[PDB]
Amino acid sequence: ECKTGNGKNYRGTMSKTKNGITCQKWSSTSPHRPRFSPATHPSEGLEENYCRNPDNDPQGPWCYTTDPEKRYDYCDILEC
Numbered sequence: 001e002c003k004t005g006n007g008k009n010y011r012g013t014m015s016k017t018k019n020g021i022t023c024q025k026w027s028s029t030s031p032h033r034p035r036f037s038p039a040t041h042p043s044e045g046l047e048e049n050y051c052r053n054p055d056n057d058p059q060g061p062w063c064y065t066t067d068p069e070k071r072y073d074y075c076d077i078l079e080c
Ligand SMILES: NC[C@H]1CC[C@H](C(=O)O)CC1
Pocket: 034, 035, 036, 055, 057, 062, 072
């Protein structure tokens, strides 16, 4: 999928950050207990471990990481 703007409305399936590290799911609490999740941001498309922009950060989609000593990181979504 592609992103346009900040990718507020991005609903692709990228699952690794721009460093290629594997996301964590939005519905897991390991390795990280998330502040953003499907519970809380029901309208945010927080599916699977996919990159999303819940907070509309000018830096584009990110996800929680399966690196325990690294809480999140941004994903590299090509523009739209
Ligand atoms: N600026 C995106 C960023 C927002 C807070 C966050 C957290 O919930 O801990 C990590 C990612």
